[PDB]
Design a protein around this ligand. Structure first.
Ligand SMILES: Nc1ncnc2c1ncn2[C@@H]1O[C@H](COP(=O)(O)OP(=O)(O)OP(=O)(O)O)[C@@H](O)[C@H]1O
Ligand SMILES: Nc1ncnc2c1ncn2[C@@H]1O[C@H](COP(=O)(O)OP(=O)(O)OP(=O)(O)O)[C@@H](O)[C@H]1O
Ligand SMILES: N[C@H](CO)Cc1c[nH]c[nH+]1
Ligand SMILES: N[C@H](CO)Cc1c[nH]c[nH+]1
Lengths: 379, 364
């Protein structure tokens, strides 16, 4: 028997439910803003990450899952999404003289030490917006993430650390001031202050971490991250910053850009920790108990009808025999509230017993009306 | 220089995503109506798994896998399918032993195939598998489910159900096939037994079926699956029966878009927040935030980075904004917000506490 590549986990039925609830909420919020999904390929040519991310980068150096295609091309399971993004953005000319506010969701691959925060295959929801210079757009991005916390009820457990790393020149003529010892540009100071203001007015509490630089070479002015001193993830749930030059660098015309990516596992962990009781929907609403002389063909028939009469309900047609007791229990296992029982009698009588699994009260109903009775019984 | 996308590995721009998501949800939703639960699996697996499960003699294992050697010399492979990975995690977490599990999963698969019609290197599959059920009943349920999917997409009148048993069939397999062939007849599902229908994998056993479309929505095939009772044992766990199918989303999306060019999705924006003048923006985002709580479910985009009214008005059009909540200095000092209906052009000055109501009325 084979196992799962250490650091690359599975999300089982029960865990899945919660992940989908949190995801929807997140997507929904992105919709409330005008943001559109963008779907990018899991692997890209290795030179991309090299060029985009940076050579000296610890990511490039020892975290990438590179390899070779049957044609000698150096391929790489993506470590992030911005690069793949800017790449297709230029590839299909969506960024030239255009505004685009998008988000993507999917896996990323990094070769790191499996931990609580870290995984070898992790999931990111991240969003980028191209075309907007001023701080105003940066502020909207923060506000977006702010809304997210508010919606998950973990607003009380994330802090905004914020910082500006100026431009190339400032970072260029900074080697002296740092390494010798071993200083910002005006337009970047103003742009940062203007953002610091928009937040202040917005009523969003930030903290300027003078020593906050991110792990990628494409960032430029704004740099920020959302951290939980609740150790939901590794500490940082969401992080991101500006990167005006990357579009040009990757071969397209210059346009401004800004974004952030968030660790879904950290998020999901935080939510489940700070909101101890946050269960999402049950897996099965009604479980169709059915037995006797040729029931089944009829039982699935009743079931299909009940699904059209009751859209939105989760109904599971029992299967492969099982005495009443067996099925009732299977019903419970799934967390069915009601059970539409169905013996031969009920079949000949054009009926279907409806048993309320909560109180046990079972009353015979006519098929055409069972839908109505369940609709009330459930809500 | 510019990097391009790995041939056979394509992106889905904003435009096409809207439609992809509408289609996905319907499918998802339908899976939910039946009791099926999702299971999320890893993109890469240990190569032996695909060898062992899929088959050594399989054209798949031979020249199609995206295998590579991890830093630790371990042979890794980018999944060509999900079943193996599924059964795998199934055994791994002890979900299959003496249990019934009805699940589905959705994500990318990879195969090194020389670039064709409905054949990519990275493609997407929605598939589902249920473990624990012997009888033809369960198989029947699975066909019924796919049938409902076509019905909901409006492509029912464009998929044919090819069916076959692959054990010259032994007693048990014959009775099992017949019993299903009937469940179908009774259910009113029209099938065609293709006596020459064998799948490409080595784990299948009796039922072997596929949904085919003549306009070439899929690579002819949209959906395909069959049984595989022994694979749980083969891969190292106690024997239990199993059945499933996987569907090619690019094919399906292609088909739905062909069989009904009508189908599109909600536009990008509902309300586009026009705004300009002496210090507006800080205030403008303030209103916008408010309107979002008052109007949940509505897609509202706050214009950014200058632009004269005309400019902002056209951008609102680009998005397909129905209304525009304009907001100059006056509106600000007056506690108001001009509500313009981009359809008629009729703009009325409304009080902010009331804008929500007007918009709600204006949209639906
Ligand atoms: N291996 C991983 N497992 C889980 N989450 C991760 C992993 N790598 C990155 N993330 C998450 O993705 C976000 C965006 O990636 P980013 O490049 O900012 O990470 P980072 O700078 O390496 O930070 P960290 O040290 O927390 O991994 C991170 O803030 C974190 O929440
Ligand atoms: N490379 C691909 N690109 C797009 N869709 C694919 C690709 N490979 C498979 N599919 C889709 O996935 C379904 C299930 O694939 P499965 O692994 O059962 O068989 P297959 O070997 O892909 O057969 P087929 O040649 O008919 O696609 C197919 O019927 C098809 O719709
Ligand atoms: N992809 C980055 C980290 O993984 C986060 C981000 C996106 N755009 C700008 N910053
Ligand atoms: N495993 C193939 C693609 O993932 C098709 C399938 C699923 N279940 C049974 N057959």
């Amino acid at each position: 028997n084979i196992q799962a590549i250490r650091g690359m986990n599975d999300y089982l039925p029960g865990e899945t439910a919660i992940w989908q609830r949190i995801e929807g909420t997140l997507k929904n919020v992105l919709g409330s803003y005008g943001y559109s999904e963008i779907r990018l390929p899991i692997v890209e040519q290795t030179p991309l990450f090299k060029r985009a991310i940076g050579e000296v980068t610890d990511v490039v150096e020892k975290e990438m899952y590179t390899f070779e295609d049957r044609n000698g091309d150096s391929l790489t399971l993506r470590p992030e999404g911005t690069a793949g993004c800017v790449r297709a953005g230029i590839e299909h000319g969506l960024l030239y003289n255009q505004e685009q506010r998008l988000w993507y969701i999917g896996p990323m691959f990094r070769h790191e030490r499996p931990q609580k925060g870290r995984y070898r295959q992790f999931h990111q929801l991240g969003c980028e917006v191209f075309g907007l210079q001023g701080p105003d757009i940066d502020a909207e991005l923060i506000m977006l993430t702010a809304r997210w916390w508010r919606a998950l009820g973990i607003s009380e457990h994330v802090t905004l650390e914020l910082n500006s790393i100026g431009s190339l020149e400032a970072r260029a003529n900074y080697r002296d001031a740092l390494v010798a010892f071993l200083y910002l540009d005006e337009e970047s100071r103003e742009h940062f202050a203007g953002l610091c203001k928009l937040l202040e007015s917005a009523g969003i509490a930030y903290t300027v971490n003078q020593r906050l630089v991110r792990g990628l070479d494409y960032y430029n002015r704004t740099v920020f991250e959302w951290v939980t001193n609740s150790l939901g993830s590794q500490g940082t749930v969401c992080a991101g910053g500006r990167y005006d030059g990357l579009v040009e660098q990757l071969g397209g015309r210059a346009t401004p850009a800004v974004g952030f990516a968030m660790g879904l596992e950290r998020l999901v962990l935080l939510v489940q920790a700070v909101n101890p009781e946050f269960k999402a929907d049950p897996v099965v609403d009604i479980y169709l108990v059915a037995s006797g002389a040729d029931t089944q063909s009829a039982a699935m028939a009743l079931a299909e009808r009940l699904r059209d009469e009751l859209p939105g309900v989760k109904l599971m047609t029992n299967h492969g025999g099982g005495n009443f007791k067996k099925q009732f229990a299977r019903a419970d296992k799934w967390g069915a509230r009601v059970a539409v029982v169905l013996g031969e009698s009920e079949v000949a009588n054009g009926t279907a017993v409806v048993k309320d699994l909560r109180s046990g009260e079972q009353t015979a109903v006519a098929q055409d009306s069972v839908a109505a009775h369940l609709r009330t019984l459930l809500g």
